[PDB]
Each structure stands twice: as structure tokens, then as C-alpha cells.
Design a protein around this ligand. Structure first.
Ligand SMILES: NS(=O)(=O)c1ccc(C(=O)CSc2ncccn2)cc1Cl
Ligand SMILES: NS(=O)(=O)c1ccc(C(=O)CSc2ncccn2)cc1Cl
Ligand SMILES: [Zn+2]
Ligand SMILES: [Zn+2]
Lengths: 261, 261
């Protein structure tokens, strides 16, 4: 029942979820004083991302974001264990303030952010089990800016009116998830952090790509107006808007970059 | 006991201090989309700021900042009530990331920030009693950046070595506190917010001057390195660094400015 707004908003999540008040919290502001190039951050490879258009994948409103379940044969190659996909979801702002990324760069929000959540399948049976274990999760984050219409993100957004309320589910035909990543995926920021939602487990290896992708103003408006945190029949509806956490203190951490300049 | 780092850091303040998770929280990012010129915002008058050079004022390290006590005949004229001074103090970062103001401007931190705390003396007998009451407090905030040596800030900084550890004290001879204000004090941001420290009561009328002041690199490194949060005998000393709160969400609200151009 945590939220992003009001009594149950983010400054109160530590009252029920202790790790939200603990170390290694995400998101953070990516700024020069804390960046250091690391030549050992070699390119990731995205395997099994081209999902069959003849198969379908479950989209669900979970009361906090919209998530698409992903198959465990989809994985990242190039980390020190195989990380297999489990779901992707987004964070965004609202129609009058389309500035709802979680990570910021030199103090600036992007319009929205996509997280593709993977868990260490070499060591764990599922993401749920991985989530409270050492380097159990790895997230790929894409910063999203207002720009051109994006047909690939639209393969998710064209289903939003069928998942408006908490608990609703819809099926999305498979498409190539790598089309949601930006240009030059070899350039990224890497750091050790946490889930950005309760229970804020400090068990995530973050990769934030350097380059944003664009979606249009109309696609942002659809995402910002389609969805509710609450059930269909709730007499106290709450719009799913501004579902991003503020940046966190970077208390002694560095962020490592695969690009020098 | 509340701190800015570790288990007792800002995400954890709302357990004991519930207003830290309530409405009207400060600090905030001051960015162009939420600014609105208000011609009602006339210049404040700083009355009794030229402190008798024949009086001494108590400087303390209270384990959270360095604070200078101020006399109640020093006040602001121009508000709906008279607001009398009680104390000033500062917030800063650390030498590896020397960007520790509390307010930001277009997403950017300044090096440090000075707050001159005043209370509504027309309504209340002292700042403690006013702190949790309607219209209780008014703070002037000066943004600080690195540049020229500043003799006036040195009137406080030259006593830092005497207040290294928590509980220590020193006496500062009176000087003209208006020298700590920037140029063109007619130009400011104004909004209703809260204490940025526990108990975070939403009872502060903020005035953040538009223009920063400068201190030298050596004065800024002194402020960042001079003080500890802990008592002198504490076998586990903690440096007093990064003593600023992260910015808070601020949606469907305006910050009024005395300047348009
Ligand atoms: N916003 S984010 O940080 O990318 C994030 C959001 C939700 C989840 C999960 O729910 C993973 S499954 C789980 N996690 C904790 C406790 C039981 N199950 C994981 C991640 Cl990495
Ligand atoms: N950082 S800040 O927001 O300028 C701020 C910091 C501390 C104090 C006080 O200590 C006011 S006196 C007091 N406050 C709360 C409880 C008992 N006494 C007041 C303000 Cl406005
Ligand atoms: Zn996320
Ligand atoms: Zn302060």
C-alpha cells in the first residue's frame, strides 16, 4: 500500500521496509564528480530479446507501474553470471510535468525511464528468490526523452487501455525488446544499488545506458493518463502518475563508465 | 539520533519525526517551469543586523551543523508579522563532491547554503514554541559558490577550529550580518515549506536569494573539513560532511519570484 504521493509516499517507505532507509539506494544523480571510466566495462550482448510475434506475453498493472513478463530464455551475456530476464516496466511523471525518470544526469530528469529486470539464473530459481541476495538482480535502464514517435515502445503502449486498473492483465504479441534500447549500447554507467521501489533491496547491479531513446508527446500523454494505481471498483481512485523515486545520497559510492568522454 | 548518513539518515527521519513525511517539505529544486513573477514581492528590510561589536554571540557545533546564536532585536521587516532572528547555520557537501546546498537551481547544487532562521515574534515568545505553529518561521537562504575570498564569512569561519566537536562552543564578536547576504537582495524566490531538518514542520516561509555569494576554495575546504558530528572522546569519529537534505517532490505548486527578468 506504499505510494509515491501522500502519507504513504517515499519518505515513509522505511517505516515498513527497512532497506529503503539503508545503504546502497537507487536511483542517483549521474554527475561528473562521482563518474570514473573503467576500461573493463566491455559490451553487453542481448540474447533471446527478439521474442516471437506468434507468442504472447503478459502485461499487468500491479498498482505501481505497468509490467510486461519476459521469458527466462531472454538473457544478458557479458556479466560475470548469466542474468535472465523476468519483467520490464516504466516510471514517468504526469501530463503537466513530463519529467519522471528515476536516474538524473547532471541534475536533469528525463521524461520517463524503462527498467528491464534480470536475475542471476546461474544461482537462483526465480527473481523473487534472487531479490534479497548478493548481486541477485541486474537492471538495464533506458532514459526516455520527449521526441519522435517510437513504434517499438508503442507495441507496449497500444495495450494500456486494457490494463488501466490494478490487477488487470492483457497479452502483448512478442516483439524485439532490443528495439527499446538506445544507440551505442556499449556506452553505459554501472553501479551497485538497490530496487527503487519497496522493499528497496540493495541487490542490484545497475546499467544505465548513456544515450536516451525518444517517444512522442502523445505517447507520453497516453502513458501518463491511461493508468490507475487502484482497482476498477475502488471508490477512491488514484491516477498512476509520478511513479519515480527522488535521487538518493551517494554515500561514498563511485559510478563507473564504459566511455571515457 | 538523526543523521544524514547510515541507518538514521533522511529516509528514516519520518519514523520519529512524522512531519518529515508530510506536506510542504523542503528543500526543492527551483526550476523555470514552476517560477512565477509576483510584483507583490517587495524588498525585505534587515533591521538590527549590525550586531554590536561590544556583544558576543554563541557559536556551537550541535552535531548537525555549526550554528551562531542571534539576538531577538534582529529582525526582518516587510512580512505579515515581524520575524525575529534566532540563529544561523550552514549546509555543505564534501571535498570529493563539493556541491552541498539544499535548494537547487535548474537541477544544480551550489557549493553550500547559509540559513538565517527567524520566528514570528508578534505571535510567539521564542523560536522553539513557534517552530510547530502556523506562520511560525521565516528563513533567509543564501546560496554559496566558490570564488573570491570573503572576509565577512571569515568572521564566522575563523572560529571553526574552536567548535570542531559536538557540544563545543565559542564566542563571536558582533558583526554586520547583512554582509553575509548577496547582491541585489531584492531579487529572491519565495515559497511556503518546511524545516529541512527534523522535525520538518511545514511552518517556514522561505526566501532564497537569486544571487549567490562567493567564498574562496580554501574557505570552502575549511568548512567541509573543520567539524565533526561526534563528541571529542568518541572512539568512532564521524566527520560533518554532506549535511543537506535531498530535494523533495513539489508538484502542482509554484515558486514566486520577485524578479521576472
Ligand atoms: N524499479 S526497479 O529497481 O527496476 C525493481 C522494481 C521491482 C522489482 C521486483 O519486484 C523484483 S521481484 C521481488 N523483489 C523484492 C521482493 C520480492 N520480489 C525489481 C526491481 Cl530491480
Ligand atoms: N535548516 S532550516 O530549515 O533552516 C531549520 C533548521 C533548524 C531550525 C531550528 O532549530 C528552529 S528552533 C527548533 N526547531 C525545532 C524544534 C525545536 N526548536 C529551524 C529551521 Cl527553519
Ligand atoms: Zn523500476
Ligand atoms: Zn538549514
Amino acid at each position: 500500500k506504499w505510494t509515491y504521493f501522500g502519507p504513504d509516499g517515499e519518505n515513509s517507505w522505511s517505516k515498513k521496509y527497512p532497506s529503503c532507509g539503508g545503504l546502497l539506494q537507487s536511483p542517483i544523480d549521474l554527475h561528473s564528480d562521482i563518474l570514473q571510466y573503467d576500461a573493463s566495462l566491455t559490451p553487453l550482448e542481448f540474447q533471446g530479446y527478439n521474442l516471437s510475434a506468434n507468442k504472447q506475453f503478459l502485461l499487468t498493472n500491479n498498482g505501481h507501474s505497468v509490467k510486461l513478463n519476459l521469458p527466462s530464455d531472454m538473457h544478458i551475456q557479458g556479466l560475470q553470471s548469466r542474468y535472465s530476464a523476468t519483467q520490464l516496466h516504466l516510471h514517468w511523471g504526469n501530463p503537466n510535468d513530463p519529467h519522471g525518470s528515476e536516474h538524473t544526469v547532471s541534475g536533469q530528469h528525463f521524461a520517463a525511464e524503462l527498467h528491464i529486470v534480470h536475475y542471476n539464473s546461474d544461482l537462483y530459481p526465480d527473481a523473487s528468490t534472487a531479490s534479497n541476495k548478493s548481486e541477485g538482480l541486474a537492471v538495464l535502464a533506458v532514459l526516455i526523452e520527449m521526441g519522435s514517435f517510437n513504434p517499438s515502445y508503442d507495441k507496449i503502449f497500444s495495450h494500456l487501455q486494457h490494463v488501466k486498473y490494478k490487477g488487470q492483465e492483457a497479452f502483448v504479441p512478442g516483439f524485439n525488446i532490443e528495439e527499446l534500447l538506445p544507440e551505442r549500447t556499449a556506452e553505459y554507467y554501472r553501479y551497485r544499488g538497490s530496487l527503487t521501489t519497496p522493499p528497496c533491496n540493495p541487490t542490484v547491479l545497475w546499467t544505465v545506458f548513456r544515450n536516451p531513446v525518444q517517444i512522442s508527446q502523445e505517447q507520453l500523454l497516453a502513458l501518463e493518463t491511461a493508468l490507475y494505481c487502484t482497482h476498477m471498483d475502488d471508490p477512491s481512485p488514484r491516477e498512476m502518475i509520478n511513479n519515480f523515486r527522488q535521487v538518493q545520497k551517494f554515500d561514498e559510492r563511485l559510478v563507473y563508465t564504459s566511455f571515457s568522454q
